[PDB]
Design an enzyme around this catalytic site. Structure first.
Site, short mmCIF file in Angstrom:
data_model
loop_
_atom_site.label_atom_id
_atom_site.label_comp_id
_atom_site.label_asym_id
_atom_site.label_seq_id
_atom_site.Cartn_x
_atom_site.Cartn_y
_atom_site.Cartn_z
N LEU A 17 42.69 47.36 37.81
CA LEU A 17 41.58 46.73 37.11
C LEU A 17 40.88 45.66 37.93
O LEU A 17 39.70 45.37 37.67
CB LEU A 17 42.05 46.12 35.79
CG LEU A 17 42.33 47.08 34.63
CD1 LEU A 17 42.90 46.32 33.45
CD2 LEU A 17 41.06 47.81 34.24
N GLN A 19 41.43 41.80 40.50
CA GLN A 19 42.16 40.56 40.66
C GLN A 19 41.43 39.43 39.94
O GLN A 19 40.34 39.60 39.40
CB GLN A 19 42.36 40.23 42.14
CG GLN A 19 43.17 41.28 42.89
CD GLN A 19 43.36 40.96 44.36
OE1 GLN A 19 43.52 41.86 45.18
NE2 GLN A 19 43.36 39.67 44.70
N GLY A 20 42.07 38.26 39.93
CA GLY A 20 41.57 37.13 39.19
C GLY A 20 42.56 36.68 38.13
O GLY A 20 43.45 37.45 37.75
N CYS A 21 42.42 35.45 37.65
CA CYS A 21 43.36 34.84 36.72
C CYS A 21 44.78 34.90 37.28
O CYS A 21 45.69 35.51 36.72
CB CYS A 21 43.27 35.52 35.34
SG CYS A 21 44.27 34.77 34.03
N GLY A 23 45.63 36.52 39.86
CA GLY A 23 45.77 37.67 40.73
C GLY A 23 45.84 38.99 39.98
O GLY A 23 45.77 39.06 38.76
N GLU A 24 45.99 40.05 40.79
CA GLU A 24 46.09 41.46 40.43
C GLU A 24 46.49 41.76 38.99
O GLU A 24 47.51 41.25 38.50
CB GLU A 24 47.09 42.14 41.37
CG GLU A 24 47.03 41.68 42.83
CD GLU A 24 47.80 40.39 43.08
OE1 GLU A 24 48.02 39.61 42.13
OE2 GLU A 24 48.19 40.15 44.24
N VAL A 25 45.71 42.61 38.32
CA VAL A 25 46.03 43.11 36.99
C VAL A 25 45.81 44.62 36.99
O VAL A 25 44.80 45.10 37.50
CB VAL A 25 45.18 42.44 35.89
CG1 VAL A 25 45.63 42.90 34.51
CG2 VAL A 25 45.23 40.93 36.00
N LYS A 39 49.92 42.13 34.94
CA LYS A 39 49.55 41.20 36.01
C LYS A 39 50.75 41.01 36.93
O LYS A 39 51.80 40.51 36.51
CB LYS A 39 49.09 39.86 35.44
CG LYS A 39 48.73 38.85 36.52
CD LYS A 39 47.95 37.67 35.96
CE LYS A 39 48.81 36.81 35.05
NZ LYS A 39 48.06 35.62 34.56
N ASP A 122 42.28 25.32 31.81
CA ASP A 122 41.40 26.15 32.64
C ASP A 122 40.56 27.06 31.76
O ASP A 122 40.46 28.27 31.98
CB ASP A 122 42.21 26.96 33.65
CG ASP A 122 41.36 27.50 34.79
OD1 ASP A 122 40.19 27.09 34.91
OD2 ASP A 122 41.86 28.35 35.55
C1 LIG Z 1 43.38 35.36 32.62
C2 LIG Z 1 42.21 36.31 32.30
C3 LIG Z 1 42.20 37.60 33.11
O1 LIG Z 1 43.35 38.09 33.36
N1 LIG Z 1 41.13 38.35 33.64
C4 LIG Z 1 41.13 39.55 34.42
C5 LIG Z 1 40.23 39.63 35.52
C6 LIG Z 1 40.14 40.75 36.36
C7 LIG Z 1 40.95 41.85 36.12
C8 LIG Z 1 41.85 41.80 35.04
C9 LIG Z 1 41.99 40.70 34.18
N2 LIG Z 1 42.95 40.75 33.07
C10 LIG Z 1 42.99 41.65 31.95
N3 LIG Z 1 42.05 42.68 31.88
C11 LIG Z 1 42.06 43.58 30.79
N4 LIG Z 1 41.09 44.66 30.69
C12 LIG Z 1 39.93 44.98 31.58
C13 LIG Z 1 39.64 44.28 32.78
C14 LIG Z 1 38.55 44.56 33.63
C15 LIG Z 1 37.61 45.58 33.38
N5 LIG Z 1 36.47 45.89 34.24
C16 LIG Z 1 36.22 45.08 35.47
C17 LIG Z 1 35.41 45.93 36.49
N6 LIG Z 1 34.09 46.34 35.99
C18 LIG Z 1 33.07 45.58 36.79
C19 LIG Z 1 33.85 46.01 34.57
C20 LIG Z 1 35.12 46.26 33.66
C21 LIG Z 1 37.88 46.29 32.19
C22 LIG Z 1 38.98 46.00 31.34
N7 LIG Z 1 42.98 43.48 29.75
C23 LIG Z 1 43.87 42.47 29.85
C24 LIG Z 1 43.93 41.54 30.91
CL1 LIG Z 1 45.14 40.34 30.83
#
Ligand SMILES: *CCC(=O)Nc1ccccc1Nc1nc(Nc2ccc(N3CCN(C)CC3)cc2)ncc1Cl
Length: 255
Positions: A17, A19-21, A23-25, A39, A122
């Site tokens: 998905l 990185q960010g928060c 790191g890697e998710v 994560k 944050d």
């Molecule tokens: C602490 C907040 C956080 O964890 N943010 C975050 C940032 C980037 C990737 C993952 C992530 N955490 C979570 N993501 C999801 N679902 C989800 C993430 C990202 C997308 N896309 C990004 C790429 N495209 C540009 C748009 C859509 C979709 C869904 N669920 C839970 C967490 Cl913890």
């Protein structure tokens, strides 16, 4: 060992998905079929605090893998980050009713943190996730206890992290919502932001934003932290906004 601990084989990662928060998710699967977010990676690496906090507007922790590589399993949000959603192709159609409703949900999650006697430290659009039906949930509790442009000056300078410093961050977050995710204090570097804010500078009213919503921002930006409003007040104000505060709101070019 507690109920949160799960074996590493019970997780089945699928698609990355980003990185960010911290790191890697990954988007993956848990016990057979259960869509989750994982994560992955200091062992201080967010879990111990999410065990006590449970709310419909906080991202829910599911399980933890305490050994390297340490995994953090939470619920999956379909739309991803709020900052990406505002900047993305969908955000351009968002109007003030949707943005205010999203702010009300965020204040509701922080209201739970408030009466639980916790601090987020944050809070910003990058650390807020969006799901179906414009559901917004607060995330990022790696720093949670009991980004200078988003941090109250007494917290950035002296470490005075309270729920009132989170209220300051919420006011900044309101500007992210009313500008479709633009960076606060445009054209200013971190040391310039810290200098001018201490002297009393505040961001102006965003274009097409009603003055009444900007007054709520300035209240969140009061120099004295105790004079900042509560999240309980912020939630009630935003939920009732278009009936009690701006009953003659009319849609515009962007808001
Ligand atoms: C602490 C907040 C956080 O964890 N943010 C975050 C940032 C980037 C990737 C993952 C992530 N955490 C979570 N993501 C999801 N679902 C989800 C993430 C990202 C997308 N896309 C990004 C790429 N495209 C540009 C748009 C859509 C979709 C869904 N669920 C839970 C967490 Cl913890």
């Amino acid at each position: 060992k507690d109920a949160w601990e799960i074996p590493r084989e019970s997780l089945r990662l699928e698609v990355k998905l980003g990185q960010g928060c911290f790191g890697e998710v990954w988007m993956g699967t848990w016990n057979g079929t259960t869509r989750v977010a994982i994560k992955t990676l200091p062992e201080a690496f967010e879990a111990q605090v999410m065990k006590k906090l449970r709310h419909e507007k906080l991202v829910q922790l599911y399980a933890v893998v305490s050994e390297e590589p340490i995994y953090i399993v939470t619920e999956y949000m379909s739309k991803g980050s709020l900052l990406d959603f505002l900047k993305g192709e969908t955000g351009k159609y968002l109007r003030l009713p949707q943005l205010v409703d999203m702010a009300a949900q965020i204040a509701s999650g922080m209201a739970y943190v408030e009466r639980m006697n916790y601090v987020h430290r944050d809070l910003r659009a990058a650390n807020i996730l969006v799901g179906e039906n414009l559901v917004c949930k607060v995330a990022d509790f790696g720093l949670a206890r009991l980004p200078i442009k988003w941090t109250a000056p007494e917290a950035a300078l002296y470490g005075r992290f309270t729920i009132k410093s989170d209220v300051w961050s919420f006011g900044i977050l309101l500007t992210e919502l009313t500008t479709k995710g633009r960076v606060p204090y445009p054209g200013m570097v971190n040391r310039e932001v810290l200098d001018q804010v201490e002297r009393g500078y505040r961001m102006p009213c965003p274009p097409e934003c009603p003055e009444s919503l900007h007054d709520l921002m300035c209240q969140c930006w009061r120099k004295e932290p105790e004079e900042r409003p509560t999240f309980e007040y912020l939630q009630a104000f935003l939920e009732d906004y278009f009936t009690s505060t701006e009953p003659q709101y009319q849609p515009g070019e962007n808001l």
